[PDB]
């Protein structure tokens, strides 16, 4: 589906994430493609809400990190901040 991240990009990333001898079913690739795509939606809606409450029109990087923190993803926040520099 054209509403999802491209499956080749997703597949590559799961492959590099696994021991060299691992195999990944076509079904598993399609399931994870949807999931990471939904991750973007999920987080964006919380960031989008924050901006509404605070009456701004731009979703920025901090809005994403706030949204990820209140949705259970604080563990990402550290690495992310460190990656921007």
């Amino acid at each position: 589906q054209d509403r999802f991240l491209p499956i080749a990009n997703v597949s590559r990333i799961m492959k590099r994430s696994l021991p060299a001898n691992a195999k990944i079913s076509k079904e598993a690739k399609e399931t994870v493609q949807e999931c990471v795509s939904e991750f973007i939606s999920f987080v964006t809606g919380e960031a989008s809400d924050k901006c509404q409450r605070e009456k701004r029109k731009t979703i920025n990087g901090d809005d994403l990190l706030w949204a990820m923190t209140t949705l259970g993803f604080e563990a990402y926040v550290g690495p992310l901040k460190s990656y921007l520099n």
């Binding site: 054209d2 509403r3 939606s41 999920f42 809606g45 919380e46 209140t70 949705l71 259970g72």
Partner: protein, 45 residues
């Protein structure tokens, strides 16, 4: 938790409302872009 359930439910209801058609929201910015010099599609002065 009770707070997570609220946000998760809101995320699911926002699902029915995803609009993937190309929507234009700064109709002025179309105008300037539409009538703007291009080298090979790229903008130029």
């Amino acid at each position: 938790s009770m707070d997570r359930e609220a946000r998760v439910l809101r995320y699911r209801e926002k699902k029915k409302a995803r609009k993937f058609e190309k929507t234009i929201r700064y109709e002025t910015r179309k105008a300037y872009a539409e009538a703007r010099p291009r080298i090979k599609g790229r903008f130029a002065k």
